[PDB]
Design a protein around this ligand. Sequence first.
Ligand SMILES: Cc1cc2nc3c(=O)[nH]c(=O)nc-3n(C[C@H](O)[C@H](O)[C@H](O)COP(=O)(O)OP(=O)(O)OC[C@H]3O[C@@H](n4cnc5c(N)ncnc54)[C@H](O)[C@@H]3O)c2cc1C
Ligand SMILES: Cc1cc2nc3c(=O)[nH]c(=O)nc-3n(C[C@H](O)[C@H](O)[C@H](O)COP(=O)(O)OP(=O)(O)OC[C@H]3O[C@@H](n4cnc5c(N)ncnc54)[C@H](O)[C@@H]3O)c2cc1C
Ligand SMILES: O=[S@@](Cc1ccccc1)c1ccccc1
Ligand SMILES: O=[S@@](Cc1ccccc1)c1ccccc1
Ligand SMILES: O=[S@](Cc1ccccc1)c1ccccc1
Ligand SMILES: O=[S@](Cc1ccccc1)c1ccccc1
Lengths: 411, 411
Amino acid sequence: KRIAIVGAGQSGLQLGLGLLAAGYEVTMFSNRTGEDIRRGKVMSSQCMFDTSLQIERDLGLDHWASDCPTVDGIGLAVPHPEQKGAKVIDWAARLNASAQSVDQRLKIPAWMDEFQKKGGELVFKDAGIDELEACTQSHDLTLVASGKGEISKLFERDAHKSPYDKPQRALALTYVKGMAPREPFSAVCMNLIPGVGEYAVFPALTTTGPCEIMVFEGVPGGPMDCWADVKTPEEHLARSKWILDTFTPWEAERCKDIELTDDNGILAGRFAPTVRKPVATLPSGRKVLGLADVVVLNDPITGQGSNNAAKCADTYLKSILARGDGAADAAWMQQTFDRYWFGYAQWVTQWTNMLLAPPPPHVLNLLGSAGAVPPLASAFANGFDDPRTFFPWFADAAESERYIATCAAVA
Amino acid sequence: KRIAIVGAGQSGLQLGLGLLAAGYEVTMFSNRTGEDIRRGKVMSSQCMFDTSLQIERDLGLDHWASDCPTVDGIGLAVPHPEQKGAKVIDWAARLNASAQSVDQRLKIPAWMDEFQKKGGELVFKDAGIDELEACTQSHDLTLVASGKGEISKLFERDAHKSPYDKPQRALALTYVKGMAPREPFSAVCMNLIPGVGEYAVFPALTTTGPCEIMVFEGVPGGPMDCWADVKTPEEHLARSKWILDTFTPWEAERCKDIELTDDNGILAGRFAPTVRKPVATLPSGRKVLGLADVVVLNDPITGQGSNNAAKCADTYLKSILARGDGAADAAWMQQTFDRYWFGYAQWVTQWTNMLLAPPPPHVLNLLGSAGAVPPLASAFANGFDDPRTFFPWFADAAESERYIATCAAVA
Ligand SMILES: Cc1cc2nc3c(=O)[nH]c(=O)nc-3n(C[C@H](O)[C@H](O)[C@H](O)COP(=O)(O)OP(=O)(O)OC[C@H]3O[C@@H](n4cnc5c(N)ncnc54)[C@H](O)[C@@H]3O)c2cc1C
Ligand SMILES: Cc1cc2nc3c(=O)[nH]c(=O)nc-3n(C[C@H](O)[C@H](O)[C@H](O)COP(=O)(O)OP(=O)(O)OC[C@H]3O[C@@H](n4cnc5c(N)ncnc54)[C@H](O)[C@@H]3O)c2cc1C
Ligand SMILES: O=[S@@](Cc1ccccc1)c1ccccc1
Ligand SMILES: O=[S@@](Cc1ccccc1)c1ccccc1
Ligand SMILES: O=[S@](Cc1ccccc1)c1ccccc1
Ligand SMILES: O=[S@](Cc1ccccc1)c1ccccc1
């Protein structure tokens, strides 16, 4: 009934807090102080859809639900190749229930505070193998929940579940104040720039209050792979506006008076999508279990990492509670991951990895048809809450045409 | 905020009770009295796994949880072709959480009583088109939850989702007292008789207390398609013992003193697996929405119909609550079904329909390997709680060999 978790992030803290509430003793390692997280760089755009939000609600952890702006739909626009400044696709659909984006700079430090208040043992150290060897002698189970930290590479890359070994997009985030609110409802406003990349923007809550988060993804080497020469926050804001002016002038109209929320409300980087084997064996021969981004890491193009992290921690918590006094051996660890992967994450991952590649004709047809077939637009919007619902019609041309027909018949 | 439901069965009553608890007005049509259901023929073997049981718990509807025997694992046996009376495969695995089988003869009438007590309007009539036309003028939404009743055929068969148009098994149930309990834990004891059929048995709760339910499925025309000449309860019990004596003598050893729980604790029949389109249009042009077995009907070989019914009613209830004052139009109806189908039921249905066909070599290899690889046996057992977790390794030979390797590595 003693659990150790290395890494104080979304999944690790959600799990630790749920374990404490169930009467477990929990040790957690953090490599940063709460205040340094609050005031440091942004980490995510963390748009969480209703199913993930509800996992938090059910643990009593939705502390910002009233203050965080709701995200009430999804929109998709595509520039018109033959009409300057216009869109050839431009539609939106309401989400059946609101999404919300609460800055991890707010959430993770507040959850660290709650974790201590509820009796967790928070240990401050940049943990390595030595700490894992110690934890595995004093605890019944040790999890690594370290996200994109270097220690995550202790787990073996799963080549068969990882089609990519290089970054597929150049990423940037810009948190801003002063953006014209979307009317008549808020949305994830997605912009697909063929052969170039993607821009998405939606309202969120950060450390200085409500904002909007601009999310940029660029095909590497293309016109939106444009962050290498950006060296200051001012240059970052300027490059953000330049992208909108150049590729999505309809969005630039909302941005005449935007400012950064704070100089650390910016990010640029890239990584290869990666799936890893969940059980790592230490030099001693003892074993540790990987959680969330340690074992399933996706590009943010589908906005699923934090959703995955909440759903992964829920599955792992349920598995721990069901195990009782049973051994937390490698078999149990593997079966816990397997339920997450085969039951859910394989479909999130396959969908995301397909979207990173150039869209085949049947996908462009789906995106266009959604603008004239509102049930299909709704299927797209609410698929973000459970990407299993995209299969098999998103990936297969013949199935896509059947689903368009089903949607048109009830429009 | 007025909902009508035609058919007082598992899904219809679960949904109606959840709607009443959320403040809706609910009208329900039943074609039988509660007492006639209690004392009539059995309808199911209704083995419900933990996720389905939890849906009921969360609605406060688990009224028999303490009295119903738990089912704590799954076992699989296959007769040895070259050793008389022996098994070439014989293994078991524990379920991570208990399953339970509460006779629908107990549950449905008790839930009808609760439905009235909680303010539902229970109307007694064999409902037809006229009642649906009336309901759709006086209610905001009308659902058909009539199971295998004739009115279910109002919904159009979905040929593309229905690979079969004929029964694939001859079915029978026998509820008995006096069976030797399984030691050291209870289980769904499955017996696969190659080219002949399947026998499964597990403990349950019926109207005279704890029992075991014998479940027989026979390839049509084969040795276990053997119920046509059975005309009395005594002949039914005798034919049940004959199957065990002939094909599974190890199970017959537990059955030396079995008796029927009651003369109506028997069933024999068959049906074609069928998927239907969820929106039916009445002569008036008004529309009704199908629920559970009306739109997704599977053979019982995987024991999923009641599980599907609980999960379907949960999805539909969530969709209704999220809709608020939004129109309950055909688009919303279709999207509600689509989330159930693409998110979940398509995988239950594909798995079940594959199992009805003769097993390919890689499946026989999986079943044999599970006897020597306990993590793989556990994957099989707990897959019954969420059949999504069988994909893609159950259906594809190359993926099956990868998963066997994953399991063996942590054994
Ligand atoms: C640009 C960007 C945009 C995104 N947008 C979205 C979005 O809109 N929606 C969405 O759902 N997801 C989004 N994500 C993904 C989401 O942010 C992550 O998937 C989520 O944070 C995963 O949670 P986790 O618990 O696995 O890791 P994290 O929350 O990253 O936590 C890991 C923690 O462990 C710490 N750590 C690392 N190494 C060690 C060590 N050795 N010892 C101790 N601590 C250590 C790290 O510092 C970090 O604090 C986005 C990601 C990026 C990069
Ligand atoms: C032999 C057998 C064994 C099974 N074993 C299992 C098992 O182990 N595990 C499992 O999970 N599932 C099992 N099932 C499946 C499970 O019993 C059903 O899938 C489940 O009952 C579906 O619930 P439902 O609400 O859709 O329909 P039901 O529970 O069948 O309810 C439909 C109700 O509507 C009534 N009705 C019909 N027509 C009308 C009308 N015109 N007006 C009013 N009322 C009407 C019917 O009389 C019935 O009472 C089994 C099924 C069979 C046949
Ligand atoms: O992370 S962005 C995905 C993206 C889109 C466009 C340009 C960059 C990134 C997101 C967030 C929530 C829901 C959907 C998308
Ligand atoms: O309905 S039986 C399936 C079956 C097996 C063997 C012979 C007949 C039928 C069941 C119940 C719960 C879980 C698994 C199987
Ligand atoms: O990839 S296309 C457009 C796009 C996707 C994600 C972020 C930005 C743009 C898509 C759009 C909606 C639903 C599924 C896929
Ligand atoms: O169809 S085979 C054997 C069998 C299945 C179902 C009812 C009786 C026997 C199987 C066994 C376990 C898990 C998946 C498939």
